[PDB]
Amino acid sequence: GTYRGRGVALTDDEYDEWREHNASRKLDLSVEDFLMLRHRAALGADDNDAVKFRSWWNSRTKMANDY
Secondary structure: OOOOOOOOOOOHHHHHHHHHHHHHOOOOOOHHHHHHHHHHHHHOOOOHHHHHHHHHHHHHOOOOOOO
16 A cells, blocks of 8 residues: 555545545545555554545445555
8 A cells, every 4th residue: 555644645546535535524634544544444454433434435436445
């Protein structure tokens, strides 16, 4: 996967789609946080924020797991 904190630009879609994540989940989250949520979901970590991200994002998009 990508990274976090290191000026992460993330894969092309998901970063832009994070701006949508901000909208849809009615939060005001930074990309790093997003990248984590998707990271865990995509890769194989099940931290609840990431799983609730998964649930929401995978009913609609189902991302582009660092593709």
